[PDB]
Amino acid sequence: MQIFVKTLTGKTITLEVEPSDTIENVKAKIQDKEGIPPDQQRLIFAGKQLEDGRTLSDYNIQKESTLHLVLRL
Amino acid sequence: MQIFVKTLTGKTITLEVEPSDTIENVKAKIQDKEGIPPDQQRLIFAGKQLEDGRTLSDYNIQKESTLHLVLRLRGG
């Protein structure tokens, strides 16, 4: 399934993932496409900062959902 | 009953299953014979991607049927 990760600069990127993939896996994909180290990524969905060890289905992230990407200060 | 699972190279994998087994069980048996994690397996039959929660009989898969195995690349 496809999900979207949006920056606050209005850029949206598309990732191919399965519900079983971890947040850490998503961060790795983001590092590959955008060069941002995973330790600097905060992903946000449903008002929560997403923990690395959980899966997308653990957060009820589904096809075409959007996650927010912010950098850590 | 026996079913067959073909890979992209045309290699054949023979599995012993029952009609009441789920697609998720079939992927487990593929993992045990071939070492491929189930999260990386897509199974195709009669032009459909097969959903994990359904049984073989739900997809009218019978003895000596052949399924196609395609894999996902970690990392896209």
Residue numbers in the entry:
A (entry chain A): 1 to 73
B (entry chain B): 1 to 76
How does the study describe this entry?
Polyubiquitin chains regulate diverse cellular processes through the ability of ubiquitin to form chains of eight different linkage types. Homotypic Ub polymers of eight different linkage types can be assembled in which the C terminus of a distal Ub is attached to one of the seven lysine residues (K6, K11, K27, K29, K33, K48, and K63) or to the N-terminal M1 of the proximal Ub. Of the atypical linkages, K29 polyUb is the most abundant in resting mammalian cells (Dammer et al., 2011). Our work shows that K29-linked polyUb adopt an open conformation and are recognized by the NZF domains of TRABID and has revealed the use of NZF1 of TRABID as a tool to study K29-linked polyUb in cells.
The asymmetric unit (ASU) contains two K29-linked diUb molecules. The distal Ub is bound via its C terminus to K29 of the proximal Ub, and there is visible electron density for the isopeptide linkage. In the crystal structure, K29-linked diUb adopts an open conformation. Contacts between the two isopeptide-linked Ub molecules are entirely polar and involve R42 and R72 on the distal Ub and E16, E18, and D21 of the proximal Ub. The hydrophobic I44 patch (made up of L8, I44, H68, and V70) and the I36 patch (made up of I36, L71, and L73) facilitate the majority of interactions between Ub and UBDs. Like K63 and M1 chains, these hydrophobic patches are exposed and accessible in the observed K29 diUb structure. The crystal structure reveals an extended conformation, but in solution, K29 chains may adopt other conformations.
